[PDB]
Amino acid sequence: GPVPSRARVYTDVNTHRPREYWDYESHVVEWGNQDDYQLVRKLGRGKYSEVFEAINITNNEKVVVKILKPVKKKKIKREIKILENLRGGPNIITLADIVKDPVSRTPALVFEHVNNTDFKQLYQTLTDYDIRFYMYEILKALDYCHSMGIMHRDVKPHNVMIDHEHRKLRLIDWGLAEFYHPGQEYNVRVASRYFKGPELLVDYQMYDYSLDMWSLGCMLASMIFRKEPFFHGHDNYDQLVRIAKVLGTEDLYDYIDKYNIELDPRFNDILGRHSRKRWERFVHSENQHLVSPEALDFLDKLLRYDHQSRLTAREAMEHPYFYTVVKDQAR
Ligand SMILES: CCC(=O)Nc1cc(Nc2cc(NC3CC3)n3ncc(C#N)c3n2)c(F)cc1N1CCC[C@H](NC)C1
């Protein structure tokens, strides 16, 4: 079979907790009053939810309501517990309340409102410093949630809300997040395609927090190279090909070998043979002001096939790329 794997850090954190911390199916839900919230306007939809701006009529606070479509109650309980567990943590969205929508008898999660700048307009004006700053802020959230035994599993631009005016960032959408347990085999059908770690694409199920760091790598790549998304595959197979054409097939094959991964026979024809490319080839006059030796060192150490060898969020936070950010935060 496949070779087992444990997280390098925060390995046993959930084991040393009370059962109720991670055994979310046990979580009883205390419903708030649905009439405290009046829907203003629709903000977006998804396969499994519809998102609205609403006003909390009690205190006139703006709020964001995620009316869930029919999903497994298990997964509702799971998102709620994770949000409750993470409440107050750095750059983590606050779950303000939970109500039973009248026009669907469905659960609706009520969230803090972030006055978010649109990721099209923002990822164009971002200076080198801004990218470093906001990457540092994201890492605070990833390290915190990972230290609390949870993996987001859907890190990507659209799940990061940024109020540029107030230099304030919230990692949102915890609906795919899960508790890390050593030895557990997780679903690979998570995350969005351009952000899927190799482990997902080759069906290595015994993955961990390091998954989030791959996704962060993908984000960083696109920000510094001004290519959204950076690995732009047509499907899960081609996605791994896109990666392979950059990271090379040599390390991919070493990776499948190390963990004795059974590789879908599909892949055997389309992966081919590819050198690992030097990041300089993605550098052009238009983007160079964002690319630096530091940025490339940091990126290289996020984007690794072998999940065990990627930076941990805390290691990432210690990288030279953030030195000016860290000094400025202490002043
Ligand atoms: C809570 C909503 C969720 O988890 N995801 C989601 C959020 C938004 N919009 C915003 C927009 C703002 N502020 C801007 C108006 C000024 N804020 N502030 C806070 C929060 C939160 N949380 C949020 N969310 C969206 F437009 C689509 C989705 N999606 C799209 C992908 C699928 C997903 N559910 C599975 C729903």
Author numbering: 3 to 333
Tell me what the authors wrote about this structure, in their words.
One such promising target is the host kinase casein kinase 2 (CSNK2, also known as CK2), which is hijacked by β-coronaviruses for their replication cycle. One chemotype extensively investigated for CSNK2 inhibition is the pyrazolo[1,5-a]pyrimidine scaffold. Unlike the widely used CSNK2 inhibitor silmitasertib, which has multiple kinase off-targets at its commonly used doses, limiting its utility as a pharmacological probe, the pyrazolo[1,5-a]pyrimidines have demonstrated exquisite kinome-wide selectivity and are highly valued as in vitro CSNK2 chemical probes. By strategically installing a fluorine atom on an electron-rich phenyl ring of a previously characterized inhibitor 1, we discovered compound 2 as a promising lead compound with improved in vivo metabolic stability.
